[PDB]
Design a protein around this ligand. Structure first.
Ligand SMILES: O=C(O)c1csc(-c2ccc(C(F)(F)F)cc2)n1
Length: 172
């Protein structure tokens, strides 16, 4: 995946977030540090928060990341699209896990109720464990794909089943 897309992936709370533009940051609601009153030097006062379940979008009143260009954010992707989940792991290793995307789903995973776009990992027979599949620390990592000549972001990592095969992308 292009270096600009990896540059946008930021360590945040108990997981990750993603800079869509110089002023727009998306992440998975449950990774947000619950007591936090200040983000990237800005008070809440200066920030527009849009929260729908496990998807959260922060819009800032000034350019936090002026090095970036604004890219396309869509509400999930057509069934059958292959995405990459842009996962950073211990030591500057970059793990773009391939997922075939499915339907909008409601699920119960480790007891909690989860809603978003379901997918099946294309990394192995099952994706149990950190080598072929996701771990709780990956939450907030972006789901991206290339369409003709540009790249689209269409959600953030919210959950994965015990077997690991099934993942859920929270969507705008
Ligand atoms: O809508 C919600 O608040 C929601 C849906 S699932 C969820 C969630 C998942 C995992 C965890 C973790 F602590 F285990 F990481 C904590 C909350 N929150």
């Amino acid at each position: 995946a292009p270096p600009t897309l990896w540059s946008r992936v930021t360590k945040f709370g108990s997981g990750w977030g993603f800079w869509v533009s110089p002023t727009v940051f998306i992440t998975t609601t449950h990774v947000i540090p619950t007591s936090a009153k200040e983000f990237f030097g800005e008070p809440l006062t200066s920030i527009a928060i849009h929260r729908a379940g496990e998807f959260t979008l922060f819009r800032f009143s000034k350019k936090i990341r002026p090095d970036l260009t604004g890219m396309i954010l869509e509400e999930g992707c057509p069934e059958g699209t292959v995405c990459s989940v842009l996962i950073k792991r211990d030591s500057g290793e970059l793990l773009p896990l391939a997922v075939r995307m499915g339907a909008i789903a409601s699920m119960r995973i480790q007891g909690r109720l989860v809603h978003g776009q379901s997918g099946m990992l294309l990394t192995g027979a099952n994706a149990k464990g950190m080598d072929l599949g996701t771990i709780p620390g990956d939450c907030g990592a972006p789901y991206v794909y290339k369409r003709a000549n540009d790249w689209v972001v269409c959600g953030v990592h919210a959950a994965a089943t015990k077997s690991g095969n099934t993942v859920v992308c929270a969507v705008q």
